[PDB]
Design an enzyme around this catalytic site. Structure first.
Site, short mmCIF file in Angstrom:
data_model
loop_
_atom_site.label_atom_id
_atom_site.label_comp_id
_atom_site.label_asym_id
_atom_site.label_seq_id
_atom_site.Cartn_x
_atom_site.Cartn_y
_atom_site.Cartn_z
N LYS A 1 -28.76 22.69 -97.79
CA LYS A 1 -28.65 21.77 -96.76
C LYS A 1 -28.15 21.35 -95.46
O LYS A 1 -26.97 21.08 -95.42
CB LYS A 1 -28.14 19.99 -98.00
N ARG B 1 -39.92 37.34 -129.91
CA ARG B 1 -40.38 38.35 -128.84
C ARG B 1 -41.77 39.30 -129.11
O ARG B 1 -42.46 39.70 -128.44
CB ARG B 1 -39.51 39.44 -128.05
CG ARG B 1 -39.99 40.33 -127.23
CD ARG B 1 -40.21 39.83 -126.35
NE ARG B 1 -40.84 40.76 -125.89
CZ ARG B 1 -41.85 40.59 -124.57
NH1 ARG B 1 -42.55 39.77 -124.13
NH2 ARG B 1 -42.94 41.27 -123.95
N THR C 1 -31.30 35.98 -119.64
CA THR C 1 -30.83 36.77 -120.42
C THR C 1 -30.19 35.41 -121.54
O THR C 1 -30.55 35.80 -122.81
CB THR C 1 -29.65 37.35 -120.45
OG1 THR C 1 -29.91 37.60 -119.14
CG2 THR C 1 -28.72 38.06 -121.53
N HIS D 1 -30.08 45.48 -119.80
CA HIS D 1 -30.91 44.38 -119.22
C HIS D 1 -31.83 43.32 -120.71
O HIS D 1 -32.63 44.06 -121.00
CB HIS D 1 -31.36 44.33 -117.68
CG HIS D 1 -31.34 42.99 -117.16
ND1 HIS D 1 -32.70 42.30 -116.83
CD2 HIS D 1 -30.71 42.40 -116.85
CE1 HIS D 1 -32.12 40.91 -116.66
NE2 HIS D 1 -30.70 40.98 -115.99
#
Ligand SMILES: Nc1ncnc2c1ncn2[C@@H]1O[C@H](COS(=O)(=O)NC(=O)c2csc(-c3nc4ccc(O)cc4s3)n2)[C@@H](O)[C@H]1O
Length: 530
Positions: A436, A211, A336, A238
């Site tokens: 659908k 990261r 996540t 988060h």
């Protein structure tokens, strides 16, 4: 394999060491420059410098090491966004203790489920959340210690982080001689995050190190430049907020925070802190779709607005970009379980509607739902990604893990997507959110992004005997009635994607997390009403 989308070589290289070691190094450099601000509480207009943040995090690190917290332990952090939040995070990373952020607005059941998975020895918690921790605690004997984050003295019988460090830190302690622990960063867990009923996402240090390459990357993140200030209204618990903020700290940025969004304060904060870049979620793009105040303030320092976590309407995004005088909205797509965004809008490579391109070190592909074959350009299928930022697995749940990630290391996102001739990716919807009508798929975003002109709504699939599902909506209004809305839609789209069985009026649309829509809650508001 012309149909595998590969991220380029990074513009900022992967760095040696643990995530902790790297955060230590950066923040010690920043700590030595007087006046460098790490965080800013916009609400109470208080700053904390890198020097301060560094010392307290280090003290907390050492205090924890002496208390007996080693690589075999886990702490949770349960709080709203605040100045104190990342102190126990940083401390725990420095010494190789896994951090389990827990969502500060869980009810007690949700909270118990989380901690029951992360099994924390120590709980860092805000005053606002202490009570819920206390209720669930009896069912979690693993917890040995509760520590209040945002008080200076002891609070209701519990030590603060400050009285806690006091208890274990030698008086002869010099923070700048502290050395972060060294350890195997593939094997050692930095983070345990929730995704949701809930699972613990285990993230090795290594995923965070990766990261930090992206975060420092001038093309896929932000270039390190002095006196950069960022405004973030993303929840630090988060993956979105955790991975961007840790990135901003490695970059030595000023993170201006808010524990709750408010249109006026947000706007004033951009102006007064000379904010170069702001993080949003699409849910907030309405407030600037209405505007009014934005042209008062001076936003001439804002180079960038970044969104993530949920589909951003193309028009809304184009519309809000204009009002801030920006070429476009920067986008990031992540899970996540991928730690952070793995599809990011690269600098100077825009495309309205796309979530961007494969990040460095990563690979992406779209696959057939029935046979799993790799699809070609413009072909809708399930988005799959592989790279060194993918979680090591779910905590104590190897079945869900193998269900998500295959031998080749491909993660199956549950998202329907496609890429174009320029290797830009487009998110259609959650596969689960598609409808659908015959054998013919209908995507909610398509019907929502024609309602927004007539306030805000959420399209879902009203089940049926013989059609399977009928496209239906849940809407928030001065006045216009159901048949008038259904007929309005029928004049806008084709045969099969009409609201053939839609419209229910509600207070507010059941949104959640980082401004995402609850398919469930909406698909029962509709079922209950028919
Ligand atoms: N940009 C997007 N567009 C459309 N949909 C998006 C999306 N991002 C997430 N989603 C949805 O969220 C789901 C996952 O939600 S989740 O698991 O809670 N995790 C996330 O949403 C998540 C984990 S990391 C992350 C981001 N990191 C960033 C870093 C920098 C930046 O500029 C932008 C971003 S967004 N998001 C996905 O499957 C998808 O359905």
């Amino acid at each position: 394999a012309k149909n595998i989308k590969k991220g380029p070589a990074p513009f900022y290289p992967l760095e040696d060491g643990t995530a902790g070691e790297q955060l230590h190094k950066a923040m010690k450099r920043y700590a030595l420059v007087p006046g460098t601000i790490a965080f800013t509480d916009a609400h109470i207009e208080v700053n904390i410098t890198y020097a301060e943040y560094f010392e307290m995090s280090v003290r907390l690190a050492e205090a924890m090491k002496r208390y007996g917290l080693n690589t075999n332990h886990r702490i949770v952090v349960c709080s709203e966004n605040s100045l104190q939040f990342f102190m126990p995070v940083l401390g725990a990373l420095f010494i190789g203790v896994a951090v389990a952020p827990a969502n500060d607005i869980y009810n007690e059941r949700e909270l118990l489920n989380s901690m029951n998975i992360s099994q924390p020895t120590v709980v860092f918690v805000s005053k606002k959340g202490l009570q819920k921790i206390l209720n669930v605690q009896k069912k979690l004997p693993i917890i040995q210690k509760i520590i209040i984050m945002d008080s200076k003295t002891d609070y209701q019988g519990f030590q603060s982080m400050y009285t806690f460090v006091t208890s274990h830190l030698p008086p002869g302690f010099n923070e700048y001689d502290f050395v972060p622990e060294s350890f195997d960063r593939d094997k050692t867990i930095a983070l345990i995050m929730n995704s949701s009923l809930p699972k613990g996402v285990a993230l090795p240090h290594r995923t965070a190190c990766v990261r930090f390459s992206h975060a420092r990357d001038p093309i896929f993140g932000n270039q390190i430049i002095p006196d950069t200030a960022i405004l973030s209204v993303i929840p630090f618990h988060h993956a979105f907020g955790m991975s961007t903020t840790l990135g901003y700290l490695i970059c030595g940025f000023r993170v201006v925070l808010m524990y709750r969004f408010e249109e006026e304060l947000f706007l004033r904060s951009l102006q007064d802190y000379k904010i170069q870049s702001a993080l949003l979620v699409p849910t907030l793009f309405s407030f600037f779709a209405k505007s009014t105040l934005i042209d008062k303030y001076d936003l001439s320092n804002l180079h960038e607005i970044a969104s993530g976590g949920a589909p951003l309407s193309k028009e809304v995004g184009e519309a809000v970009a204009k009002r801030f005088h920006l070429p476009g909205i920067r986008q990031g797509y992540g899970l996540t379980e991928t730690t952070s965004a793995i599809l990011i809008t690269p600098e100077g490579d825009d495309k309205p509607g796309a979530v961007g391109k494969v990040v460095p070190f990563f690979e992406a592909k779209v696959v057939d739902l029935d046979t799993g074959k790799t699809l070609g350009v413009n072909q809708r299928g399930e988005l799959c990604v592989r790279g060194p930022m993918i979680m090591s697995g779910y905590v104590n749940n190897p079945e869900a893990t193998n269900a998500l990630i295959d031998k080749d290391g491909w993660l199956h996102s549950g998202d329907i997507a496609y890429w174009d001739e320029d290797e830009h990716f487009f998110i259609v919807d959650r596969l689960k959110s598609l409808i659908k009508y015959k054998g013919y798929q209908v995507a909610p975003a398509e019907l929502e992004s024609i309602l927004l002109q007539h306030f805000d709504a959420g399209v879902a699939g009203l089940p049926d005997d013989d059609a399977g599902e009928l496209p239906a909506a849940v809407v928030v209004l001065k006045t216009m009635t159901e048949k008038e809305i259904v007929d309005y839609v029928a004049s806008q789209v084709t045969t099969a994607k009409k609201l053939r069985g839609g419209v229910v009026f509600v207070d507010e649309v059941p949104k959640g997390l980082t401004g995402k829509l609850d398919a469930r809650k909406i698909r029962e508001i509709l079922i209950k009403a028919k």
